[PDB]
Every structure is written in structure tokens, then in C-alpha cells.
Amino acid sequence: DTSLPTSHTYLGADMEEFHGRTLHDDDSCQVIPVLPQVMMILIPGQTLPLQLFHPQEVSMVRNLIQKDRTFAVLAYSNVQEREAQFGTTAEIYAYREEQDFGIEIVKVKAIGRQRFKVLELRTQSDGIQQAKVQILPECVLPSTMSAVQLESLNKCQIFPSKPDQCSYKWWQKYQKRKFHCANLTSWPRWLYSLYDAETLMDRIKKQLREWDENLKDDSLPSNPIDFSYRVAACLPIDDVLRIQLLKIGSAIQRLRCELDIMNKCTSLCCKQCQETEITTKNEIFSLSLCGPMAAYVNPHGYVHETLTVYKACNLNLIGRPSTEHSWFPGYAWTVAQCKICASHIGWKFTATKKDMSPQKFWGLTRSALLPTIP
Amino acid sequence: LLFCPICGFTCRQKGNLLRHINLHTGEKLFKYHLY
Amino acid sequence: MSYNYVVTAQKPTAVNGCVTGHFTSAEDLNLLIAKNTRLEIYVVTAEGLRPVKEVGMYGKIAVMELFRPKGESKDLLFILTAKYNACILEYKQSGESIDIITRAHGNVQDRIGRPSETGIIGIIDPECRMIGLRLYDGLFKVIPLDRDNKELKAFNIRLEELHVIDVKFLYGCQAPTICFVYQDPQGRHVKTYEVSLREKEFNKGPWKQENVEAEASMVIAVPEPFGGAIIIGQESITYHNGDKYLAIAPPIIKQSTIVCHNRVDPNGSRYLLGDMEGRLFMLLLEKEEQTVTLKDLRVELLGETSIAECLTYLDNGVVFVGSRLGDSQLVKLNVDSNEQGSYVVAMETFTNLGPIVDMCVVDLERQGQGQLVTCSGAFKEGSLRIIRNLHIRTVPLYESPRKICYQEVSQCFGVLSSRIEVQDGTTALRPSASTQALSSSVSSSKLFTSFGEEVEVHNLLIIDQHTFEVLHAHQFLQNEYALSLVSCKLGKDPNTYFIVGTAMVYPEEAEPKQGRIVVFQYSDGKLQTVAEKEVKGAVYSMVEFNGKLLASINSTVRLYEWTTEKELRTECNHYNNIMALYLKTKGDFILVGDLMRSVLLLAYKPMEGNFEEIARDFNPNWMSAVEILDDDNFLGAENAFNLFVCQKDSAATTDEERQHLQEVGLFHLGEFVNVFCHGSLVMQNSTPTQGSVLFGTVNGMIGLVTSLSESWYNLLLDMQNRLNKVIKSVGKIEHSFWRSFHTERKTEPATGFIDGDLIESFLDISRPKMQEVVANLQYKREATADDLIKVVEELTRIH
Ligand SMILES: O=C1CC[C@H](N2C(=O)c3ccc(N4CCOCC4)cc3C2=O)C(=O)N1
Ligand SMILES: [Zn+2]
Ligand SMILES: [Zn+2]
């Protein structure tokens, strides 16, 4: 079942949810609070689970819930110095309170909504930080052939519908019909296909299906912007690449960059070692509907972006299979360390009953992985 | 079985507990995480 | 800021619209032709076409319709521009003076709205009660056609159908009725609505919705007594009128898509149809009396013409074929076919340079006056055009020419060409330049379907510069796409070579993985393959860089050197993470650009033997061409038919500023620029302008960009501002609005560009108008009409 991870059942039972989605006007200037403990780079449309214990941030969340349910997640370029040029607004869409261990705890789940630029960063006297936010817009470009088009051929630009057989031939027909007027320019049709939204989404869909057997077409957004953000949220890439993707404002350019990453970045090595290969892009399998990767929260509230892989090497096992707070139900986890540098890489999930498939796999933290081009 | 609060690393002694925790890359925001 | 000056050496020649009516007078039969920004009015005569007027519009004519509201003695012309300037114009003649009056005008744009994927549609009710416009999906704009609506006030009506293919106003309807074809997830359907001006809404149409062919694309409103409508798709032609329904599936039309039509008989008994491959058919509506009703439909293949953008039947079997891909035609329809079975006989040909996909400047006669050799047309209309100061010579090729370069030493042009063949082994559709060459060779390199599918065969043609015969034709490997072509010497080799970059293209591969750089030598009538290099990508562009070869392989820029063994040796590489589609050089500077307007300026370091990035400017937008005006200024063609200029400030005192190419000039050209090239068509050998860059566009326009001084630019900007207050535009479109850098939901004022056409128009205005323009103009001394006349004449002499 690929839908279980997205529900974050590990947090608890049904959580109070808010359907009041809110979006600020493009280019608008806002003032947004920043949660001090969050050190993750959030892509729009990406889910972020959180566990708050500190009284200050608990109070901040409580106040936010009553006003806009929105807070800023900063893409820290200099984490130690807390210098961030860009960030993402995150809207709280689920919230619950708990009194475990005789201590107040707040369990939350937010979703990234809009990228933005950082203008000012003011630290409040109560330990909370506020940011002057410039809501970035979505650079939307017209079809490449819109400018160079023939009035007679303006009709027949709407294809009947989308039914290799009946697909590759359909795509050949689509290229021939959509970029016919490419004969009026100095470039071929197949070159304009490399900048076409639909073709790029189709190629990315082929790759994702290669990563997921049960990936139905409807599961992905039909909008190029949302599709590009969804793809970016599930790529095993480092932080620098994630920031670079966030900077790109054009859906076409984002899709092209994502395709480049997926076609070139095939190895995943230890971040600290920089050379100890840990796995390859072929071993990635999607056990979550959101993608091969998903964010989870451990008991102490730390956020781990786990990527699931069939096989992993150069890993030493610490502890013994324990099912406590296991992110994937029915699987007992055991700590995995880099065989060379001993740095924690993830957890090996082993089956508890022999009827489960797969019988074993690994979940590697994204922050501990470096994508490498062989 | 001192449990590391980040990854779940387990050990019975103490020194290796720090030897693991300080090996983690980040600020670790302990005041915001430890129960 | 930059100071540039743009002129039109050749006005657009591609025909995008054509209508027939009674515009100049109630008795004269007039033909109106819309060529992008030009409107030509001819009087149809037994001897052909008599030009009566030619007008320039501050806009791209998208809709052009003739209508005669009650009380008018002759037709009025409705014109909509691509910027949504609508105008109702009248032809007023007084003695020998002709002027186009603007009966009404206004902008019909909407703040919000997505332009329809099927483009702008403009129709007029047969009773001239309203004008209907389809500009955005889900909306239908109605302009009441009352005489008090002098500002063309319009109102929107919501359309529940968002994917509308075609729409027409029906004849013989008590209330304004529209019949349109629209696509839903089920398929294509024909629907009808009644437009209510009082309620400003739609009411149930005269007949219920019907299902039509999945490829139904064309709607024809048949006039009385038939009424009803005809739906034309890729397989069948159907006629719907109330409960009456008729359908035919003539096989002849299945070979190609019918894209244009025109009504021959005023009662609708005959129609002209034109396909995408240049075939012309006649559709005949058999008539039977009961009132009168339609009996049968039949289609006859009249013959072959130039690929028709539009058709219009004038009289006496004469048809004007307006073509975008080739010369426009005036043909005669004969009652009886000739020996070949063709009823069509060509009477006149009208030159069309567009599309200009590439061009070069060469001084063939060697007098210091250059000539422009352009690759014009496409498919069977492809050809070479030789343009000199404006005499034009045509060399038909019958296949698409893509690139051209001139080899002075061998006195020949190297032309990359493409021809379409049908898999059946492949068979050529017709003889062409690549197949009729004197000598021929086929690529034979060790490196590296269905019946009916079309394939592209790429050739390099060596063409004599005097006779323009195809001296040689070399065919490239199967699936090989030749993208770039240069002619130059390399290293210490005294020989001159044709160097071709190619990519291996397969349908299953989104991006090419293999490619070739081939070095041929044309000597003593033979084209020999001197050298061959295999690369892992598409060689999009190539240039000669100080005796080396600078090539663009996918997203890499690679400098090769020509060794004494006559082989290409990699000198250095640079990785740009953008496909280097456009590659230009000057001195040691290299300009790299991709299709998304990303610009990157590198510099070659001879001592380090590698490239370093000098500057960068990334701004998502479609870019069709770039050029290097000088060491600091770079000219490019941007989406929405714009020109832009980027400037480099090396002495900026800041690393951030030194690495930014600020845009210092924008100008809405109205043309899709395909190629830039340094050169001039005027005799050379104090001048007010520096440099000269010709550019060729899709519509066949040739333009020239030159550089002015600050003083001259200021004077000419003042002159423009003064002229705009005196010259009256057709349709009352403001010049500043017309030239404002335009984009979908964005418009910036033009800057850094002097509209050469507006300045040149200063010589045509009358003396009182000249006095008004020059009044209180500071030359120190107050400028006088004579001084400005001299200045404008000097400017005109540059082309
Ligand atoms: O899949 C999984 C396994 C890994 C991950 N995780 C941790 O990082 C962690 C750290 C300390 C933990 N203890 C706290 C003290 O006493 C009991 C156990 C437990 C976990 C844990 O499940 C998780 O939450 N879910
Ligand atoms: Zn390591
Ligand atoms: Zn740990």
C-alpha cells in the first residue's frame, strides 16, 4: 500500500484539520513568523510534519492557528549563521495537542504553498523570528509556437484526446501537429519538443513509473507548475540542488532541470564521505504515493526525509529490529551507519510476517545522501 | 541502551553516546527537541 | 542606454488575409490583402489586379472583414489587430486623393482571460447587427453594430464550451444565430445559439446539438435559400440544417487537411477548398426544388496551386491564392481540364520572400555593394532569393532550404536543404534540387516505421554563384539532421572547407545522443569528405573562432583545433547547463543563448587555453535569434515579435554588476525575426550611423538595425514624438502603443530604438505638416524643415 506513508499515521489518530486554504497575492509583501526548530527546505505542495515541545514555539503555533495558519520555512544558505535568501510559506492543514509524559506536545502537519524572497529578518524579544517576505510569482510562458503560427492552421490545434502502441504513435502525431509551423523557424520540431510542457511531463511520468509500478496517471497533477513542484519534492537531491530548483520560477525550466537531474544523477553516496557509494537510482522504489521519498518525524520531533530503496551497501547495522514508532507499519527498523565514516545514513526495515512484500528494504535520510553523476 | 534522540542509535555505555551524537551534522536544536 | 535605429528594407510579403467586396465604390470589385502590417487594396479588372491603395497599420492585422450595414452605399472594413485594436474603416476618395476614414475604433482587450488555443476568431452577422469575437476561452465578445457605437463598446457572453474550434453566423435567421464546433471529452459537437443583444445573452439555437467527426474543424455558413451549415473535417463533409442532415466521405480530401475555403457563387452553390499541400478542390452543392433544399454534395480536385493560406474567388474564374510559404498566385479556373487533368492555370505570381529561415550577404559582382541571398519558403515552395538594390531573383529548389553560406574561393554557396520522402525504402514526392544535382554523393560512415510515414532527408547542396545551378548534392546519413553550416579555413591549412554539424535524431529519443561534424572540401567540381568527427550530442551551431572551430554540442561549447594531419582535436570545453542554440563570436568574446532567452557571455583566454564566463542574463522568454552589435551590445529577437538589446558594463566596480547584462533597448517589431547577419545592401565608402545588421523574418520582411550617437538619437526621438501628433494612423492606433514591447499580459514602453519607418514618413507629409513638426525644435539653432529633410534623406540613404 503506497497511501499509508502520506497519512502519517505514526503521529496519532484523526487530527483536527483545516480546509481554509489561503494564498497571498503575487508580488505581495508580507510579514511571516519563522519556527526556530525547522531546518528543512520546503517545496510548494510538500507535506511537513512537526512535533513542538518548546513553550515558545507551541505558543507561536497556537497563535498562528487562529490567524492564518501560515509560517515561513527558510532555505538556509548559511545554517550556522541563519542567512537565508529564499524560503517557502507553509500552511498548517492538520493540528493536534497532546499531554504525553506530563509535558505539552503539539503535533502538526503543514503543506508548502508559495515560494518567496527574504527581505528582512527581525528577531523578536520573545525568541521568535519574523521575516519580511516577497511572494514570488509563477513565470508562465505561452506555447513556443504561439508567436510563429499560421492562421489557417489555428484550427485543428486541439487534438481529439489521449487514448508504445497507441501512445508512441500518438506522441509522434502530437509533435507533428503541434510544431508544424516550426518549419517557419530555424529549429526543428524535435527541438521545440524539448521545451514543451506536455512532452517533459510525459517523460518525467515515464521515469516516475519506472520508480513506481502502481503509479496511475491521475495521481500526478495535470498542471505543469504543480507537476514540477511534485517532482521536485520527491527527488533524492542535496540541499544546494533543492535551493536551485526553488529559485527557478519557470515551470518549463524546472521540468527540464528535473529531467536533467533524473537522467544524470544516478548514484547516491554518503554526504560526509562524498565517495562511498550507498545506492543507485535503479534501486529506488516508491512505497509512498507522494513518491519514493517522504518526510517523517521521529519521537523526539526530528524530521527525516526518508527515501526507500530495495538494496543498500556499505552500511553497518546497529541495534536490533524494533517496531517502536516504526514509520512503515509491520516493519522493524534497525539503525544503519556508513560503513566507512560511521555517520548515520538511515534504517533497514525488515518484515515481521513472511506474507509481506517486499521482505526487506532500506530507508535512507535525504540529508545524508549526495547525488553523484557517474 | 542510551537512545540517540535523532536517529535511534543505541548503546549501553556513555562516551560512544556523544561520539555518535556530535557526529550528527546540524545544530541539533536540543532545547526544541528533547521531551 | 543604447541608441539603435531600425528600418524596413523590404516590407512583409507573406499574405495572411484576403477578402473581396465593394470597398472603393459600390460598382468596383475590390480585393483587399492583409500582409501582416500592410493592407493592399486592388480593383479587380479583366486584365488582373489594379492597385489602388496600400496602407500601413500600426498593428498586425488578425481579422479583416467587409460588411455593409443598412444605409451604407458601399462596404465598410472591420480590422482587428493582434493587440486587440478594432476599427471600422471607410474608403473615402476626393478627386485624386485617397484616404481611409476611421468610422469607429477602440481596444477590445480584457484585463483577465487566456487567449484561445485556436486563436482569434472574428465574424459579422449577415444582417450586420453585431460583430462576434472569440478571443479568450469561455467568452464570446459582442460588439453591437449600431452607428452610435463609435468606440466599439463590447460585452461578453459566457460560453459553457471552452474548446471552440470554429464558429460562424448563420444565414436566414430571424435572430443573430451562431453555429460553432466545440470539443468535449466525448468528442466534437456542433451547437447553435441565438445572440440576444437586449439580454446580452445566448438563447437556445434553432436546432439541437449534433455529433460530428472527431477531426471536424471547419464551419461554413451557407447562404439562403439553403441556410444551415457545412462542417468539414479530415475525413467527411457534412451539411446540417434543422433536421436535415447530409454527409459524404470523398477519399480525395483524405490525403491532406483542408485549411482554407471561399464561396464562389453568391447563393452558396459552389465553394473553393484548399489543402495543406497546395491542392485546390471545388465543393458543389446540388440543388433540388420542393422551397429549395440541398440534394447532394460532391468534391472535385480542381488542381494544384501554391500552398494557400487563403483563397478568394474574384470573377470570371479568376482566383487569388494568398500564400504564407510561397509566392501568392492569381490563377484561372477553366471549364475543361487540360491534358494533365488540371483545371487551374496560373496567370500571375506575386513575390513572397517569407519565411526567411537563413540568409547571407555576398558581394557577387564585386563593386562594394552587397547582395542578400536568403533561404525562402518551405516544402515545394522552398527557394533561394537574391536581393539587390529592390531587385529580387528567385531560384526554385522545390525543397526546404535551412542554412546557407558563401565560399568565395570556390565561387559557390553551400545550402543545407531538407526534402520529405514517403516510406514505401523511401520515395521522393517530387523532383527537387537535392535529386537533380549535376553530381551527387551519399554519406557513407561506419559510425552509428510504417508505410506512409514521412521522413526528412537532409542534403548539402553546392550551388554555383553565377548560374545558381546545383553543382553538387551530398546526402546525409539516415535519421541524420543537419543543423549548422560554416565555411572557413582552420589552423595553418590554406584550404577552405564546408563544415556541417548534424545530430542523429530518432523518434524514441527525446534528446539526440549522437552527432557529427563533417568537413568537406569542394574542389574541381567534386565534394570530398576531408574529415569527420563523432560527438555525443547535437551540433546546434558552429563558428570559426580565430582559426579554430567553436561548436555547440548539446549544452557544451567545445573549441577544436585543426591539426596538420587534417583532423579536429579538442582544444577546450565549457559546460553551460543550457543548450547553446545560438553561438556568436567577436574577437575573443562568445555569446551563447538558448531558446528560453538565457544569454551567457564567455571569453576565451589564450594563455589559460579555456573559457571564462564574463556575464550572464537569464530571463524566461522565447528567443528566436541573437547577434553581437559590438563589443558591449547584443541584439536579440524576443517573444511577441520584439527586439531587445543587452549591454555589458565591464567597468562597473562591482562583481555583481560586471556579471549582469542589463537590457538597454526594447522595441515591438511586429515580425518574427529568424536570422541576423552583419552587412549592408548599399554602396560603401562622417556617416550618422555606425554598423549595419540585416535581419530576416517569417513574413518575408527584411529589416536593418544600425547604431546612432546620443545626439542623433535624442533628435530623432523628439522627431518621433512630434510626428505622432501630426501623422494620422489608420484605425487611430497610437504609435507608442504599437511599438511598446508586448507580451501576453505585459507591455513596457519602447526604449533605445528609433522607428525608422516613422522618421522616413517625414518626407511624405506636406510642407505645412513639416512646419508643424519642426516648430520650436532645437537643432543650438532652431531646426528648420530643410535641415530635417537633409537628415532624413541621409538616414534613408543607409538602405
Ligand atoms: O522508522 C522509524 C525508525 C527510525 C525513527 N526513530 C528515530 O530516529 C528514534 C530515536 C529515538 C527513539 N527512542 C526514544 C527513547 O526510547 C525509545 C526509542 C526512537 C526512534 C525512531 O523510531 C522513527 O521514528 N521511525
Ligand atoms: Zn560516510
Ligand atoms: Zn543520532
Q: Is A338 annotated as a binding residue?
A: yes
User: Which residues sit with their C-beta closer than 6 Å to ligand 1?
Assistant: A 298-299, 324-327, 333, 347; B 3, 5, 7-8
A208 occurs within a structural domain: yes
Residue C706's alpha-carbon distances to A352, C4, C450, C721, C789, in angstroms, are 78, 6, 51, 20, 20
| C155-158 and C741-743 strand pairing | unpaired
CATH of the domain at A231: 1.20.58.1480
What lies within 8 Å, CB to CB, of C768 at 6+ separation is: none
Q: Which amino acid is at C303?
A: G
Best of A155, A196, A252 to disrupt the C interface (most C CBs within 10 Å) is: A155
- A129 and A224 co-located in one domain: no
C-alpha cell at C88: 471600422
Contact C646, C658 (CB under 8 A): no
Contact A120, A99 (CB under 8 A): no
A159 occurs within a structural domain: no
Partner-chain contact A300 B23, CB within 8 Å: no
CA distance A149 to A140: 19
What lies within 8 Å, CB to CB, of C109 at 6+ separation is: C83, C84
The number of beta carbons lying within 10 Å of the beta carbon of residue A30 is 18
Partner-chain contact A37 B29, CB within 8 Å: yes
C-alpha cell at C78: 472591420
- A242 and A331 co-located in one domain: no
Give the ligand at the shortest distance from the Cα of A348. Answer: 1
A147 occurs within a structural domain: no
Enumerate the β-bridge partners of residue A114.
A89
Residue C355's alpha-carbon distances to C23, C183, C499, C742, in angstroms, are 30, 32, 25, 22
Looking at beta carbons, which pairs linking C554-561 to residues 24 or more positions away fall under 8 Å? Answer: C554/C511, C554/C512, C554/C579, C554/C580, C555/C579, C555/C580, C556/C580, C557/C583, C557/C590, C557/C592, C557/C602, C557/C611, C559/C604, C559/C611, C560/C517, C560/C533, C561/C490, C561/C491
Task: For chain A, say whether C34 makes contact (Cβ under 8 Å).
Answer: no
| DSSP single-letter state for residue C778 | B
Neighbours of chain A (3+ CB pairs under 8 A): B, C
- A124 and A203 co-located in one domain: no
Q: Nearest CB to A154: which of C119, C508, C622?
A: C119
CA distance A294 to A283: 16
Give the ligand at the shortest distance from the Cα of B17. Answer: 3
A104 occurs within a structural domain: yes
- Sign of the C-alpha dihedral computed for residues C292, C295, C296 and C300 taken in this order: negative
Task: For chain A, say whether C355 makes contact (Cβ under 8 Å).
Answer: yes
Residue A316's alpha-carbon distances to A172, A313, A336, in angstroms, are 49, 9, 6
- A231 and A126 co-located in one domain: no
C-alpha cell at C149: 457605437
A306 occurs within a structural domain: yes
C-alpha cell at C395: 531560384
Experimental technique used to determine this entry:
cryo-EM
Torsion of CA C51, C57, C59, C63, to 10 degrees: -50
Contact A336, A345 (CB under 8 A): yes
The number of beta carbons lying within 10 Å of the beta carbon of residue A15 is 16
Partner-chain contact A184 C259, CB within 8 Å: no
Query: DSSP 3-state assignment of C641?
Result: coil
Contact A86, A42 (CB under 8 A): no
A117 occurs within a structural domain: yes
Smallest CA–CA separation between B6 and chain A, in Å?
Answer: 6
Closest CA to C436 of C470, C481, C393, C404: C470
Best of A318, A348, A349 to disrupt the B interface (most B CBs within 10 Å) is: A318
| DSSP single-letter state for residue A18 | -
Q: What residue numbers bound the domain in which A115 lies?
A: 4-135
Residue listed under C-alpha cell 530623432: C716
CA distance C706 to C712: 12
Residue A272's alpha-carbon distances to A189, A339, C398, in angstroms, are 44, 12, 63
Question: Quick check: bond before C355 cis, omega within 30?
Answer: yes
What lies within 8 Å, CB to CB, of A194 at 6+ separation is: A200, A256, C510, C511, C579
Closest CA to A95 of A64, A120, A134, A118: A64
Closest CA to C247 of C264, C263, C231: C231
CA distance C536 to C416: 22
Q: Whose CA is nearest to atom 11 of ligand 1?
A: B8
Q: Which amino acid is at C288?
A: E
C-alpha cell at C47: 486584365
Q: Nearest CB to A139: which of C507, C620, C672?
A: C620
For chain C, helix, strand, coil in percent to 5 are 10, 50, 40
Q: Integer distance in angstroms from the first to the last C-alpha of chain B? A: 17
What is the tally of helices (H) and strands (E) in chain A? 9, 16
The number of beta carbons lying within 10 Å of the beta carbon of residue C666 is 20
What lies within 8 Å, CB to CB, of C309 at 6+ separation is: A150, A151, A152, C14, C15, C16, C260, C322, C323, C324, C325
**C718 phi, psi to nearest 5 deg:** -60, -40
| DSSP single-letter state for residue A5 | H
- A131 and A9 co-located in one domain: yes
∠ CA C336-C271-C21, nearest 5°, is 110
Mutate to test the pocket of ligand 1, among A9, A10, A51, A298 (most ligand atoms within 8 A of CB): A298
C-alpha cell at C677: 547577419
Closest CA to A344 of A365, A371, A323: A365
- A300 and A247 co-located in one domain: no
Contact C156, C139 (CB under 8 A): yes
CA distance C439 to C428: 18
Best of A27, A85, A153, A265 to disrupt the C interface (most C CBs within 10 Å) is: A153
Helix (H) or strand (E) run with residue C418 in it = strand C412-423
Among left, alpha and beta (phi > 0; psi -120 to 50; other), residue C537 is left
- A118 and A19 co-located in one domain: yes
Domains in chain C (CATH in brackets) are 12-314 (2.130.10.10), 713-796 (1.10.150.910)
Enumerate the β-bridge partners of residue C454.
C422
Torsion of CA A204, A205, A206, A209, to 10 degrees: 130
- A47 and A92 co-located in one domain: yes
Query: DSSP 3-state assignment of A180?
Result: helix
CA distance A316 to A344: 9
Closest CA to C556 of C609, C491, C600, C620: C600
CA distance C666 to C754: 10
A143 occurs within a structural domain: no
Query: DSSP 3-state assignment of A157?
Result: coil
Residues less than 5 Å from ion ligand 3, measured at CB: B 4, 6-7, 9
CA distance A66 to A76: 27
What lies within 8 Å, CB to CB, of C703 at 6+ separation is: C6, C7, C8, C9, C669, C671, C673, C694, C695, C697
Structural domains counted in chain A: 3
Torsion of CA B15, B21, B22, B27, to 10 degrees: -150
What lies within 8 Å, CB to CB, of A263 at 6+ separation is: none
- A226 and A284 co-located in one domain: no
- A18 and A83 co-located in one domain: yes
Name the strands in the sheet holding C318-322, side by side, starting at the edge strand that comes first in the sequence: C310-315, C318-322, C328-333, C344-350
**Residue C567 burial by CB count (10 A; 0-12/13-18/19+): exposed, middle or buried?**
middle
Q: Whose CA is nearest to atom 17 of ligand 1?
A: B3
Contact A352, A326 (CB under 8 A): no
C-alpha cell at A148: 510563429
CA distance C140 to C156: 5
- A221 and A252 co-located in one domain: yes
CB contacts, 8 Å: A203 with chain C: 510
Contact C754, C708 (CB under 8 A): yes
The count of C-alpha atoms lying within 13 angstroms of the C-alpha of A214, restricted to the half-sphere facing its C-beta, is: 8
CA distance A38 to A54: 13
Distance B3 CA to ligand 1 centre (A): 8
C-alpha cell at C309: 493560406
List the single residue in A with minimal CA-CA distance to C376.
A184
Enumerate the β-bridge partners of residue A371.
A268
Query: DSSP 3-state assignment of A190?
Result: helix
C-alpha cell at C209: 446539438
**Residue C656 burial by CB count (10 A; 0-12/13-18/19+): exposed, middle or buried?**
exposed
Question: Quick check: bond before B5 cis, omega within 30?
Answer: no
CA distance C79 to C16: 13
Q: Which of A265, A287, A307 is the last residue of a domain?
A: A265
Output b/e per residue, A326-342; b: 16+ Cβ within 10 A: bbbeebbbbbbbbeebe
∠ CA C260-C263-C265, nearest 5°, is 160
**Residue C275 burial by CB count (10 A; 0-12/13-18/19+): exposed, middle or buried?**
buried
Query: Domain boundaries in chain B?
Result: 2-33
Task: Indicate the angle between helix axes A224-232 and A197-211, nearest 10 degrees.
Answer: 30
A174 occurs within a structural domain: no
What lies within 8 Å, CB to CB, of C344 at 6+ separation is: C280, C302, C303, C304, C305, C319, C331, C332, C333, C334
**Residue A144 burial by CB count (10 A; 0-12/13-18/19+): exposed, middle or buried?**
buried
User: 3-state SS string over C366-416?
Assistant: CCCCCEEEEEECCHHHCEEEEEECCEEEEEECCCEEEEEEEECCCCEEEEE
For chain A, helix, strand, coil in percent to 5 are 30, 35, 40
CA distance C241 to C264: 21
For chain B, helix, strand, coil in percent to 5 are 30, 10, 55
CB contacts, 8 Å: B35 with chain A: 53, 101, 103, 300
Give the ligand at the shortest distance from the Cα of A294. Answer: 1
Gaps in chain B following residue numbers (C to N > 2.5 A): none
Q: Whose CA is nearest to atom 8 of ligand 1?
A: B7
Contact A106, A96 (CB under 8 A): yes
Q: Is A333 annotated as a binding residue?
A: yes
CA distance A94 to C303: 70
CA distance C573 to C612: 11
Task: Indicate the angle between helix axes A251-264 and A197-211, nearest 10 degrees.
Answer: 40
- A8 and A129 co-located in one domain: yes
Name the strands in the sheet holding C139-144, side by side, starting at the edge strand that comes first in the sequence: C121-124, C130-134, C139-144, C155-158
C-alpha cell at C646: 543587452
Among left, alpha and beta (phi > 0; psi -120 to 50; other), residue A355 is alpha
CA distance C727 to C720: 10
- Could you give the residue ranges of the DSSP H alpha helices within C302-344? none
Q: Whose CA is nearest to atom 2 of ligand 1?
A: A326
Q: Which of A119, A135, A151 is the last residue of a domain?
A: A135
Contact C144, C125 (CB under 8 A): no
Task: For chain A, say whether C112 makes contact (Cβ under 8 Å).
Answer: no
Q: Nearest CB to B6: which of A54, A302, A333?
A: A302
CA distance C552 to C541: 5
The number of beta carbons lying within 10 Å of the beta carbon of residue C396 is 16
Q: Which of A265, A289, A308 is the last residue of a domain?
A: A265
CB contacts, 8 Å: A191 with chain C: 581, 595
∠ CA C377-C381-C383, nearest 5°, is 60
Partner-chain contact A319 B10, CB within 8 Å: yes
